[PDB]
Ligand binder design. Sequence first.
Ligand SMILES: [Cl-]
Ligand SMILES: [Cl-]
Length: 271
Amino acid sequence: EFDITVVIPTFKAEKTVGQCLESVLSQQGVSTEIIVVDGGSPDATISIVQSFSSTNLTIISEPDRGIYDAINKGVSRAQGGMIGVLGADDVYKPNVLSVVKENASRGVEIVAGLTLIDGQLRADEQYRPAALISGIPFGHNAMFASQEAYRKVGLYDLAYRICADAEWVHRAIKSDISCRKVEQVFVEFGTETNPEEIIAEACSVIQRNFPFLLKEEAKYLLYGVRGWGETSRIEQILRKYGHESVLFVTALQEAFPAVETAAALEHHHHH
Ligand SMILES: [Cl-]
Ligand SMILES: [Cl-]
Protein backbone atom coordinates (compact mmCIF):
# COMPACT_ATOMS: atom_id res chain seq x y z
CA GLU A 1 0.00 0.00 0.00
CA PHE A 2 2.82 2.41 0.86
CA ASP A 3 6.14 2.57 -0.96
CA ILE A 4 7.69 4.62 1.87
CA THR A 5 7.17 5.15 5.58
CA VAL A 6 8.90 8.20 7.05
CA VAL A 7 9.39 8.09 10.82
CA ILE A 8 9.78 11.60 12.27
CA PRO A 9 10.92 11.84 15.92
CA THR A 10 9.78 15.21 17.29
CA PHE A 11 10.47 17.16 20.47
CA LYS A 12 9.84 20.92 20.77
CA ALA A 13 9.97 21.17 16.99
CA GLU A 14 7.47 23.98 16.34
CA LYS A 15 10.08 26.03 14.48
CA THR A 16 10.81 23.47 11.77
CA VAL A 17 8.33 20.58 11.78
CA GLY A 18 6.13 22.20 9.13
CA GLN A 19 9.01 22.43 6.67
CA CYS A 20 9.96 18.85 7.52
CA LEU A 21 6.48 17.53 6.77
CA GLU A 22 6.16 19.58 3.57
CA SER A 23 9.42 18.03 2.31
CA VAL A 24 7.80 14.57 2.59
CA LEU A 25 4.29 15.40 1.40
CA SER A 26 5.52 17.09 -1.80
CA GLN A 27 7.48 14.00 -2.91
CA GLN A 28 6.34 12.87 -6.35
CA GLY A 29 6.01 9.36 -7.71
CA VAL A 30 5.41 7.56 -4.40
CA SER A 31 2.77 6.57 -1.87
CA THR A 32 3.97 7.58 1.59
CA GLU A 33 2.97 6.99 5.20
CA ILE A 34 4.21 9.30 7.95
CA ILE A 35 4.62 8.31 11.61
CA VAL A 36 5.44 11.22 13.92
CA VAL A 37 6.84 9.96 17.24
CA ASP A 38 6.61 12.86 19.68
CA GLY A 39 8.58 12.98 22.92
CA GLY A 40 6.11 15.11 24.85
CA SER A 41 6.38 18.49 23.16
CA PRO A 42 4.64 21.22 25.22
CA ASP A 43 4.90 23.78 22.37
CA ALA A 44 2.93 24.09 19.12
CA THR A 45 4.40 20.90 17.60
CA ILE A 46 1.24 18.77 17.97
CA SER A 47 -0.95 21.59 16.63
CA ILE A 48 1.28 22.07 13.57
CA VAL A 49 1.45 18.34 12.81
CA GLN A 50 -2.36 18.07 12.98
CA SER A 51 -2.70 20.97 10.52
CA PHE A 52 -1.52 18.65 7.72
CA SER A 53 -3.56 15.98 5.96
CA SER A 54 -4.18 13.21 8.49
CA THR A 55 -5.21 10.31 6.22
CA ASN A 56 -1.75 8.75 6.06
CA LEU A 57 -0.18 10.35 9.16
CA THR A 58 -0.08 8.82 12.65
CA ILE A 59 1.12 10.49 15.86
CA ILE A 60 2.57 8.19 18.52
CA SER A 61 2.49 10.00 21.87
CA GLU A 62 3.76 8.03 24.84
CA PRO A 63 6.74 8.10 27.21
CA ASP A 64 10.06 7.05 25.73
CA ARG A 65 13.62 6.23 26.73
CA GLY A 66 15.20 8.69 24.29
CA ILE A 67 15.17 9.35 20.58
CA TYR A 68 16.17 5.81 19.56
CA ASP A 69 13.30 4.30 21.57
CA ALA A 70 11.01 6.71 19.74
CA ILE A 71 12.51 5.67 16.39
CA ASN A 72 12.03 2.00 17.30
CA LYS A 73 8.34 2.59 18.05
CA GLY A 74 7.87 4.14 14.62
CA VAL A 75 9.86 1.50 12.75
CA SER A 76 7.83 -1.23 14.45
CA ARG A 77 4.55 0.27 13.19
CA ALA A 78 5.76 1.18 9.69
CA GLN A 79 3.82 -0.35 6.80
CA GLY A 80 5.91 1.01 3.93
CA GLY A 81 8.24 -1.04 1.76
CA MET A 82 11.18 1.22 2.62
CA ILE A 83 11.52 3.09 5.92
CA GLY A 84 13.31 6.39 6.42
CA VAL A 85 14.00 8.41 9.58
CA LEU A 86 13.83 12.19 9.17
CA GLY A 87 14.53 14.57 12.02
CA ALA A 88 12.03 17.35 12.64
CA ASP A 89 14.67 19.95 11.69
CA ASP A 90 15.72 18.05 8.55
CA VAL A 91 14.25 18.12 5.04
CA TYR A 92 14.34 15.67 2.16
CA LYS A 93 15.31 17.05 -1.24
CA PRO A 94 12.90 16.76 -4.19
CA ASN A 95 12.49 13.41 -5.98
CA VAL A 96 14.44 11.46 -3.34
CA LEU A 97 11.62 9.10 -2.40
CA SER A 98 11.15 8.09 -6.05
CA VAL A 99 14.87 7.21 -6.23
CA VAL A 100 14.46 5.01 -3.15
CA LYS A 101 11.38 3.32 -4.59
CA GLU A 102 13.02 2.60 -7.95
CA ASN A 103 16.24 1.16 -6.50
CA ALA A 104 14.29 -0.84 -3.91
CA SER A 105 12.15 -2.31 -6.71
CA ARG A 106 15.21 -4.39 -7.66
CA GLY A 107 15.49 -5.87 -4.17
CA VAL A 108 18.17 -3.67 -2.61
CA GLU A 109 17.69 -3.57 1.16
CA ILE A 110 19.36 -0.25 2.06
CA VAL A 111 19.35 2.84 -0.18
CA ALA A 112 21.38 5.77 1.13
CA GLY A 113 22.32 9.16 -0.23
CA LEU A 114 24.45 12.18 0.58
CA THR A 115 23.81 14.66 3.40
CA LEU A 116 24.23 18.45 3.34
CA ILE A 117 25.39 19.82 6.72
CA ASP A 118 25.91 23.57 7.17
CA GLY A 119 26.47 23.94 3.45
CA GLN A 120 29.00 21.11 3.10
CA LEU A 121 28.64 17.49 2.11
CA ARG A 122 29.07 15.06 4.98
CA ALA A 123 32.41 13.27 4.62
CA ASP A 124 30.88 9.88 3.95
CA GLU A 125 32.75 6.57 3.93
CA GLN A 126 31.91 3.41 2.04
CA TYR A 127 29.57 0.66 3.26
CA ARG A 128 32.17 -2.12 3.56
CA PRO A 129 34.33 -3.71 6.31
CA ALA A 130 36.46 -0.56 6.67
CA ALA A 131 33.37 1.14 8.15
CA LEU A 132 33.58 -1.28 11.11
CA ILE A 133 36.62 0.59 12.48
CA SER A 134 34.83 3.92 12.10
CA GLY A 135 31.39 5.44 12.62
CA ILE A 136 28.29 5.39 10.46
CA PRO A 137 29.41 5.61 6.78
CA PHE A 138 26.53 7.83 5.59
CA GLY A 139 24.17 10.14 7.45
CA HIS A 140 21.46 8.19 9.20
CA ASN A 141 18.70 10.50 7.98
CA ALA A 142 19.85 9.89 4.40
CA MET A 143 19.28 6.14 4.87
CA PHE A 144 16.25 4.10 3.87
CA ALA A 145 15.98 0.43 4.82
CA SER A 146 13.45 -2.20 3.87
CA GLN A 147 11.04 -4.05 6.12
CA GLU A 148 13.18 -7.15 5.57
CA ALA A 149 16.36 -5.27 6.48
CA TYR A 150 14.84 -4.21 9.79
CA ARG A 151 13.54 -7.73 10.41
CA LYS A 152 17.00 -9.23 9.78
CA VAL A 153 19.09 -6.65 11.65
CA GLY A 154 16.68 -5.80 14.46
CA LEU A 155 16.02 -2.52 16.22
CA TYR A 156 18.28 0.24 17.50
CA ASP A 157 20.23 -0.65 20.66
CA LEU A 158 19.17 1.76 23.39
CA ALA A 159 22.46 1.30 25.24
CA TYR A 160 23.86 3.80 22.71
CA ARG A 161 22.22 7.17 23.31
CA ILE A 162 24.17 8.80 20.46
CA CYS A 163 25.70 6.18 18.15
CA ALA A 164 22.94 3.58 17.92
CA ASP A 165 22.65 4.55 14.24
CA ALA A 166 26.25 3.49 13.60
CA GLU A 167 25.86 0.27 15.58
CA TRP A 168 22.81 -0.67 13.50
CA VAL A 169 24.58 -0.02 10.19
CA HIS A 170 27.58 -2.02 11.43
CA ARG A 171 25.21 -4.92 12.20
CA ALA A 172 23.86 -4.60 8.65
CA ILE A 173 27.38 -4.77 7.16
CA LYS A 174 28.21 -7.82 9.29
CA SER A 175 24.96 -9.50 8.17
CA ASP A 176 25.67 -8.77 4.46
CA ILE A 177 22.59 -6.57 4.03
CA SER A 178 22.65 -5.18 0.50
CA CYS A 179 23.26 -1.46 0.08
CA ARG A 180 23.16 1.05 -2.76
CA LYS A 181 24.76 4.45 -2.20
CA VAL A 182 23.32 7.16 -4.48
CA GLU A 183 25.67 10.12 -5.04
CA GLN A 184 23.09 12.87 -4.67
CA VAL A 185 21.90 14.81 -1.65
CA PHE A 186 18.94 13.12 0.01
CA VAL A 187 18.74 15.26 3.17
CA GLU A 188 19.68 18.74 4.38
CA PHE A 189 20.47 18.09 8.06
CA GLY A 190 19.50 20.71 10.62
CA THR A 191 22.23 21.93 12.97
CA GLU A 192 20.36 24.34 15.28
CA THR A 193 26.80 17.23 23.51
CA ASN A 194 30.08 16.58 25.34
CA PRO A 195 32.49 15.28 22.67
CA GLU A 196 34.02 12.87 25.19
CA GLU A 197 30.64 11.12 25.45
CA ILE A 198 30.45 10.77 21.67
CA ILE A 199 33.99 9.39 21.56
CA ALA A 200 33.24 6.84 24.29
CA GLU A 201 30.19 5.53 22.43
CA ALA A 202 31.98 5.45 19.07
CA CYS A 203 34.84 3.41 20.52
CA SER A 204 32.36 1.02 22.17
CA VAL A 205 30.61 0.49 18.82
CA ILE A 206 33.93 -0.45 17.19
CA GLN A 207 34.77 -2.81 20.04
CA ARG A 208 31.43 -4.53 19.46
CA ASN A 209 32.74 -5.48 16.03
CA PHE A 210 36.28 -6.32 17.22
CA PRO A 211 36.14 -7.22 20.93
CA PHE A 212 39.90 -7.86 21.16
CA LEU A 213 40.60 -4.12 20.82
CA LEU A 214 41.38 -1.93 23.78
CA LYS A 215 39.37 1.29 23.94
CA GLU A 216 42.43 3.39 23.12
CA GLU A 217 43.11 1.21 20.06
CA ALA A 218 39.54 1.57 18.81
CA LYS A 219 39.96 5.33 19.23
CA TYR A 220 43.25 5.31 17.31
CA LEU A 221 41.66 3.46 14.40
CA LEU A 222 38.62 5.75 14.30
CA TYR A 223 40.77 8.87 14.38
CA GLY A 224 43.09 7.42 11.74
CA VAL A 225 40.40 6.57 9.21
CA ARG A 226 38.59 9.90 9.75
CA GLY A 227 41.77 11.92 9.25
CA TRP A 228 41.74 13.24 12.81
CA GLY A 229 44.85 11.45 14.07
CA GLU A 230 48.11 9.81 13.15
CA THR A 231 48.39 6.43 11.43
CA SER A 232 51.98 5.37 12.19
CA ARG A 233 50.85 2.58 14.55
CA ILE A 234 48.39 0.92 12.14
CA GLU A 235 50.88 -1.75 11.06
CA GLN A 236 51.63 -2.56 14.70
CA ILE A 237 47.91 -2.94 15.45
CA LEU A 238 47.54 -5.14 12.38
CA ARG A 239 50.36 -7.43 13.50
CA LYS A 240 48.98 -7.55 17.04
CA TYR A 241 45.49 -8.69 16.07
CA GLY A 242 45.50 -9.87 12.45
CA HIS A 243 45.44 -13.48 13.63
CA GLU A 244 42.16 -12.79 15.42
CA SER A 245 39.97 -12.04 12.41
CA VAL A 246 40.16 -12.02 8.62
CA LEU A 247 37.41 -9.38 8.68
CA PHE A 248 39.66 -7.13 10.78
CA VAL A 249 42.56 -7.54 8.34
CA THR A 250 40.21 -6.70 5.46
CA ALA A 251 38.89 -3.65 7.30
CA LEU A 252 42.37 -2.24 7.92
CA GLN A 253 43.62 -2.96 4.40
CA GLU A 254 40.59 -1.17 2.92
CA ALA A 255 40.82 1.78 5.33
CA PHE A 256 44.62 2.16 5.08
CA PRO A 257 45.83 1.05 1.64
CA ALA A 258 49.39 1.92 2.67
CA VAL A 259 49.50 -1.24 4.82
CA GLU A 260 48.56 -3.54 1.91
CA THR A 261 51.89 -5.40 1.96
CA ALA A 262 51.58 -6.03 5.71
CA ALA A 263 47.94 -7.07 5.34
CA ALA A 264 48.97 -9.58 2.67
CA LEU A 265 51.31 -11.13 5.23
CA GLU A 266 48.51 -11.47 7.79
CA HIS A 267 46.31 -13.20 5.23
CA HIS A 268 49.23 -15.49 4.40
CA HIS A 269 49.93 -16.44 8.02
CA HIS A 270 46.44 -17.05 9.36
CA HIS A 271 43.73 -16.80 6.70
CL1 LIG B 1 28.86 3.19 0.12
CL1 LIG C 1 25.23 6.90 -7.74
